[PDB]
Structure formats: C-alpha cells, structure tokens
Design a protein around this ligand. Structure first.
Ligand SMILES: N[C@@H](CCC(=O)N[C@@H](CS)C(=O)NCC(=O)O)C(=O)O
Ligand SMILES: [Zn+2]
Length: 400
C-alpha cells in the first residue's frame, strides 16, 4: 500500500559518475550544487515570509507555529552568518513568547519551544537578562505529573530535548544534568511499570503508550523514546542500558514488516506510512543509535533496509515536510551516511534535495500549515540549508 502514498522515484541509484555533480571524493558538496541549494533557499524564504502573514497568530509552537520559524532562522544564521537571519529569528521569538498556553511541556508542541529558542536567541544577541529569564521559566515548566506521556510531541523526552537544546547552544551546562537525570528516572520507571502491568516484561522490559495506543515510531512512540534513552547525554547506566533498554529495542526490531517498514502501532497490519512520525524514516534513528551503542550488526542491517524502503517509497504525495514528507525522509539518508561514511546515502539525500528543488511541481497536497517547520516550507528550507554541510546535518527538534 506504500506505493499508493508515494511518487515513483525517477532517479538512478548511486554511482561515482552520477555523484560527481553533487559532491567530491571527500563528500564535500560542489560549489555549483551548493549554490543551487542556496538559490532555492532564498526563493522559498520569500514565499515563506509572505505565507506566514496569514498564519494563526495564536500558535507559537515549534511544530506548527512561530518558535519553529525562529528555529529555522537560528539555523540559517549559523549556516550563512547573515545578521538579518538572527533579526528575523528575534521577531518570531517575540511572537512565540506571546503565545504560551501553559498546556504542554515540549519543545515541539509546548511552552518549552518558545522558552528554549528564546533563551538561545537572546544569548546570541548578548542579552543576558532575557536569556537567563527564559532559562528560569524553562526549568520551572517541569511539574510533577504521573499522567504525563513519555513521547516526543507531548511527553517527557520532548521536554528533555528543550533542555539539551539550551545546553548545546550555550556550550555549557546551563541546565544541571540532575534535572535531566530525574526525568530519565521517571521515564524508565514508567516503562518498567507498564511492561509489568501488561506482562510485556519477558519480551520487552519497557513499554510506553500515548492516547491508549502502543505507538512504535519517532513522534509518539517507542523508537523515539529508546533513541533518547540510548543517548550519552541522558546518561542512562550501563546496567539499565543492557537490562532494560536493549531488549526493549530488540522488541521493536521484531515488529518490522517484510518490506523493512514499521507499523504505526503494535498490532497494525497495514504497511502504509513512510514518515518520520510513523514508519522507517523515524525508526531508523533508534536502529542507528542502537548500532552505535551495542555494535550489533543486526541494527545496521535493519538501518540499511530502512534506507531502501525510503529510497523506493519516500517521495510522498503528502508533500516536502519534515514530519511526513520528502525532506524529513531525506534526513534518514543523512543519518545513515554520517554513521557509515557510505557516499551512496549522501547521494540519496542529494537526489531528494533535487526533488525538493522542484517544490510545488508534483501535485503534492497543500499542508494544513503550509509554511511551518514540521508540516510545511520552513522544514523543507531547513533541510536544504542543513545539506550544505552534510556531516553536521541533524533532523531538527529531534536528532542529537
Ligand atoms: N496535518 C497534516 C496532515 C495529517 C497527517 O499527515 N498526519 C500524520 C501524523 S503527524 C499521519 O501519519 N497521518 C496518517 C495518514 O497519513 O494516514 C498536514 O497538514 O501535513
Ligand atoms: Zn507526521
């Protein structure tokens, strides 16, 4: 059913000859291809700026609203060094800070996005008072909540991301490790408890759910949570890594469809969605991190299969977005490239970029938020700009 959701891939797979137009033998993009990316970035930014005039004033979130546009501009400032991008970021930060709803804790869908992004923006503009005030508020956002989910968009790991985002950008431990540690403990305890209650323990020592479903993928599910639990920056003990996390990862691996794709939820039979939010483009991060941490070939094998699924069925009719679109899917190639150093995957990313350079010429659906970071144009632009230096590229608001 995957074929129904994708355009046929018109591109030939990697060879040295075809790759030479995109990058040199060291994987550095050609000046020509770099400039083509740059030209499209500039073109799309104009469209995005105009389109955002019609966006909902109330939505300040990273996923669909103002803080996500600020994320893009902070990134463009880092990539290009144009002070105008930092100024644009400031404007969007200011909008986002007028939109706090006090309903959610996450970087993507909650108040942590505006606060963390503002902290970084103010820091980059040498505004210590405002930066520090934002950090204080971010730290305070963490309330005791036994019913809070564990996943990326609305749960504990999404709050953790905001903390990591501040620390990374300040280059110092602004938020004490102990804050992250306490949340990590809660996540692990929650997982063990649910697995015990449902008698998953034997096959999976941890289990998580969101809206009463066992989601598998990056956005709402197991792959996102385990990706985080395996991250050195969360400092999960070797004991818990091996006794709890690894067998839980292995359980997810065993859910793989024959195609190499993954079900949205445990028990789902229809092999349909090839998205970051649901399916191989999101699960790949868990597999790659598991390979890095455990060094078992099976994880790398599965990652290759993800890349092949995405190469065949990853050019989505949904559009060019990050959450569920061609640009988000292209990041899967970059993560595998950055692990393997295999230029085949850099090439695949470049070809997906080629597709995005024909933005709007394919008959894709218009997203609900056509200009947002996760549904719309801002995310596509983010990807194009990130591709300029492939080794540093990271799926935004998610990848560490
Ligand atoms: N609001 C989205 C459309 C909804 C959507 O695609 N949702 C994702 C999850 S975030 C999905 O996988 N939907 C199920 C499907 O495609 O069947 C947009 O405008 O891009
Ligand atoms: Zn999605």
């Amino acid at each position: 059913h995957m074929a129904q959701r994708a355009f046929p891939n018109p591109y030939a797979d990697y060879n040295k000859s075809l790759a030479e137009g995109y990058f040199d033998a060291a994987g550095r993009l050609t000046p020509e291809f770099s400039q083509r990316l740059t030209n499209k970035i500039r073109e799309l930014l104009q469209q995005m700026e105009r389109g955002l005039k019609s966006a909902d004033p109330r939505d300040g979130t990273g996923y669909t609203g103002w803080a996500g546009i600020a994320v893009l501009y902070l990134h463009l400032y880092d990539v290009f060094g144009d002070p105008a991008y930092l100024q644009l970021a400031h404007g969007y930060v200011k909008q986002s800070l007028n939109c706090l709803t006090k309903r959610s804790i996450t970087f993507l869908c909650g108040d942590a996005g505006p606060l963390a992004v503002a902290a970084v923006l103010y820091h980059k503009m040498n505004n210590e008072k405002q930066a520090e005030d934002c950090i204080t508020r971010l730290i305070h956002l963490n309330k005791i909540d036994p019913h809070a989910p564990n996943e990326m968009l609305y749960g504990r790991i999404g709050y953790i991301y905001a903390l990591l985002f501040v620390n990374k950008n300040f280059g110092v431990e602004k938020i004490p490790q102990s804050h992250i540690q306490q949340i990590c403990e809660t996540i692990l305890t929650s997982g063990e408890n649910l697995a015990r209650k449902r008698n998953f323990t034997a096959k999976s020592p941890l289990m998580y759910e969101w809206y009463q479903e066992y989601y598998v993928g990056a956005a709402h599910g197991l792959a996102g949570i385990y990706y985080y639990l395996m991250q050195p920056s969360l400092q999960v003990s070797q004991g818990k890594l091996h006794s709890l996390v690894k067998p839980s990862v292995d359980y997810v691996c065993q859910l793989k469809f024959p195609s190499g794709n993954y079900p949205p939820c445990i028990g789902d039979n229809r092999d349909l969605l090839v998205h970051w939010c649901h399916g191989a483009p999101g699960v790949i991060y868990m597999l790659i991190q598991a390979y890095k941490v455990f060094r078992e070939e099976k994880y790398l094998c599965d990652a290759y299969q993800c890349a092949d699924v995405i190469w065949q069925y990853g050019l989505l009719k949904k559009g060019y977005g990050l959450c569920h679109g061609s640009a988000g899917n292209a990041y899967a190639f970059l993560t595998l490239y950055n692990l393997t150093q295999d230029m085949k995957y850099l090439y695949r990313a470049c070809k997906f970029a080629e597709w995005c350079l024909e933005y709007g010429e394919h008959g894709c659906r218009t997203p609900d938020t056509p200009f947002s970071l996760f549904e719309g144009m801002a995310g596509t632009i983010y990807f194009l700009a990130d591709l300029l230096v492939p080794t540093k590229a990271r799926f935004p608001a998610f990848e560490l």
